[PDB]
Symmetry: D2
Subunit: 339 residues, 4 copies
């Protein structure tokens, strides 16, 4: 029933990666043929879905593992440049229905900053979406995290442009996959491993002072915050009453609740649970929660029929459904933006 | 105000491990001297705490990382035998205030089964408490999980004796610690890494059919279930509507909600949050939630003043506070058990 | 999807009162012709609905205002006897699908007690359902409440027979209607007046010590408890921290939370809200909540699609759906009672 | 711990009414001597309490039953004028700590409108606080409600001046008291009668179209909204799916959720329950909830220790604590208003 909703964890893939798309679909889809069509389509099926389910505007991003799977830095950068130019062309068909996040190679802080800057300045992209750590090293088994001082130039570029960064999950690989996941492979993806990666990375940013050096940085997590709201009391307790007396305060000057009020956002992607939503409204606040789908790994129908029919007060339905994203992404006037 | 409460995530250490105790305390205590006294004391300070805060009965267990830190299997087994004999002597001082969980070396399924059987039959121990995977391999960098068929003889010993198994966390080590945690070390322990380990292990048991082969097995998680209640909707969705159509149903015959109704328990250790407690009552049911403290890493005062004063209906305060544990551990008559 | 559900706030009317039935339907139904057929039907339409929606057992009761609308005590008693004889015959047709509550004239405690006894001992009725106060006095402008010593013989009969009493609401009338409701008549019934009546009567029983003199008496409230769980904190505060120091303790020996743990039940009748149900789970506890519908004022479809599809842990779905009622009413097998 | 809090359900009484003040205290206080001093004190004890507990600003209002108890309209109007003149002088002593609501005789819409206007325009009062219906008729047994067209000139004055109206409760009297409450007198006041009165009056305004004819009018309810959020689902169901098809739509153009999003506010006065506050956050939304105390019937300590220590996200603590009220009342700087 609500119109003009905003979704922003919505993936596409390049048509030339059909084999990679189908392998990934064998993990995370029960209808490979529809998945292939839907994840490559931009302007037809995706708009029909949005028109049926009251989604006015979507910010598109590249599927996982995406560029973060590419440990050759020259190929990785070329892939990201290609994706960004491709999606910028595709969204011109429906500029009042589609924005895009920058796709980035994250091997090098300045290289990523430049390409994000290009995407925002040349194309009006809305921010960056990155699938956790960048694969690096001779066989891809090394991981590049962004929660350190080398990445200050990148985070400062995010705050200068005043665009958010969405920390999306990706599958475990190499040594980590072999050691922890191969003997329980059905837990890979949404059931467990996705949250473990994103929460590690974002809390790393918390405790390594990224939001102290970059107080205006906005960071977005999908799936209602990858377990983090559940432990808000536990993390805050073990920060303020424990680790902050043992040295953590050297690199982390605010409480975990402060960072959720000032820096961190969560979305409803892949977590269509009113009971959890209500719990998240208490632990993080309706102001910091955004509607999102996780299409085409989730369907518009599951996400939107859930949200439209959830028992929820009118104030927060509007805020979560569009008005929070409207203020954060400086969005004026898209289809049904004030309906 | 409530008397006769039961706590069961309550740690002790052997007096001869003072150096190891103090290093661990440097990570997780702000008062090393009191921690050393409290974690070694059984029958004086611990009883004074319990008497002040209405805790009638406690099931004691060995501190983490405990025997799971020992990758030499002969030393590991000897350490566990020693701990079990030691704690059995100590609790005879106050049999109406103290029980114990078996401490186990988990290098070998039958060896562990035998020692659990010895602990239960000879000493009346209440079950087993194990700190996640057993360290193994030449330098301790290998991990032994119990979610496979080799461990059927062990789980069958748990159901034959009809005693629960408590899956407690331990710190990351070796390769995992270096790769994921060293650059964000303040997240080790309660803030994050503990839950990531236990939830992986228990959901592994779920998806590898442990509770299908052993339908009566009772498994206990601390800290309100190590994030798992937060994702009950998400896990159930990605099981029943996704992975269960791609092959997961071969080794996992019930829903994740079924397993929480029939097999899995959570406790309130280290998570003194009424808001999270209420959310857990919805996602798992008051019947499956047990009071616990996590002493001496948490204080009786934080845990018991929280629980005693939490806004909660009388039915569930009794059940969570003692009556659930009373039925599960076949407990008759301890101090204030019906007060 | 849940089978064997038990509903117990389900009304019927005698065929000969079609005129009263249509007048009541002009207030509370948007489909009067269907309402007339549904409220008089017992063994055909009602069964089909229950077969479609997983409802194995129903305890039937007489529509409001029912006998409580009759202020001639001789006429009232005769209608009560007439109704009980009628419904006892009707439920013989499908005894594994239906039980009944006694319908009573509440003009005289001993008279009400004897007719409840007859219903239980002659017909096997499961308790009583009464529509709030009994209209009395020359023009029906007086109200008979049952929260006083004259009614001890009646409450002692409920506890001797060990069967609950369901405090159902009825419309305001007479002076009360004219002074408070006539100028805001759309508030009459479910929107507000109903809960005001029942909550006053039941909290009267609390504060006049009915449950003190009859500690085994079980009292049931519909509609998730007629506002009372919302004010559980506030009522308990203004009792224990205020009125109990000024005189209330003289006739009220326990806390409001005790009485909800020991004497009071609530049902989901006409209140198909998971958010409010979760809150009631916190404030009264899943053990004290019973599924129910409020047919034909509510549909089977609304009530059952809500409950069957509500996000809820498996333990409490089974308890609220049937097992709480199976125990309170000592029910034998019925259709799908263990499905 | 939160500084600069705003409370706005805070009562005072005129020194010359000590006899009425002590009689009311024999109903609602366990310490009459302190209550007498506290309810008459403005600038000493009240300030000390507020300094100890982080309350920067208070909007004062006249105790119940106040002017609404006076059925001589000439006497009523003169007491109203007397009270407003008195409190305006008292609050000059500490204008950065205190504001006031207008006290009104509600016998005549135009008379009430003019005295509200005088209070706002001469004294800078922030709105009106009225204790439910105005006692009227020869012996005060009639009630004047304000949910009708005769009161349009008054509601238009509230919207012209752009200041809210706080619907406070008062005791039942006369025929209503005798018929419903005299036999269960411990329910009078906070336990039940108060909410029944306010919720009836405010929902009357809804269903008689006051907010339709005055869409900018703001109405405030104490005590987390006098049961109404509990029945939000039930009221909305029986409006939109029932009464709105039978005639209600004629005088009621929007849903109950709309009116809570657009017109209605609730406060935490006398309802210091985090569990119930979370539920109200789901059903009405944190943007529509204001901190308040209900002093001196409640203590600063109860209200403020609850709110300052309640587990709550930082965004909503700031909004409920002060920022919601700072905006609704267009407040200038006050003590710690940005602390
Ligand atoms: Mg996604
Ligand atoms: Mg522990
Ligand atoms: Mg009914
Ligand atoms: Mg008040």
């Amino acid at each position: 029933h609500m119109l003009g909703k905003i979704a922003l964890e919505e993936a596409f893939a390049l048509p030339r990666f059909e084999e990679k798309t189908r392998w990934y679909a064998s993990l995370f889809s029960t209808d490979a043929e529809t998945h292939v069509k839907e994840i490559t389509d931009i302007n037809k099926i995706r708009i029909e879905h949005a028109d049926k389910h009251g989604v006015g505007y979507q910010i598109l991003s590249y599927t996982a593992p995406g560029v973060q799977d590419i440990w050759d830095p020259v190929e990785a950068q070329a892939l990201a440049v290609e994706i960004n130019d491709y999606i910028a062309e595709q969204v011109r068909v429906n500029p009042d229905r589609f924005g895009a996040f920058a796709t980035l190679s994250m091997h090098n802080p300045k290289e990523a900053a430049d390409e994000l800057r290009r995407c925002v300045e040349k194309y009006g992209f809305k921010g960056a979406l990155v699938n956790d750590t960048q694969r690096a090293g001779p066989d891809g088994d090394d991981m590049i995290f962004y929660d350190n001082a080398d990445w200050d130039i990148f985070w400062q570029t995010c705050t200068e442009l005043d665009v958010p960064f969405y920390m999306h999950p990706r599958n475990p690989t190499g040594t980590i996959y072999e050691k922890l996941w191969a003997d329980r492979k059905w837990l890979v993806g949404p059931p467990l491993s996705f949250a473990h990666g994103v929460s590690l990375h974002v809390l790393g940013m918390v405790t390594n002072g990224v939001f102290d050096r970059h107080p205006k940085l906005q960071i977005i997590m999908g799936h209602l915050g990858e377990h983090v709201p559940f432990d808000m009391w536990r993390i805050n307790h073990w920060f303020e009453d424990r680790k902050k007396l043992l040295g953590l305060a050297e690199t982390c000057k605010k409480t975990i609740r402060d960072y959720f009020a000032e820096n961190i956002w969560i979305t409803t992607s892949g977590h269509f649970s009113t009971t959890t939503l209500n719990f998240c409204m208490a632990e993080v606040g309706s102001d910091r929660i955004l509607f999102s789908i996780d299409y085409p790994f989730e369907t518009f129908s599951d996400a939107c029929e859930w949200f439209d029919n959830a028992e929820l007060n009118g104030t927060d339905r509007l805020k979560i459904g569009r008005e929070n994203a409207k203020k954060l992404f400086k969005l004026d006037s898209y289809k049904d933006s004030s309906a």
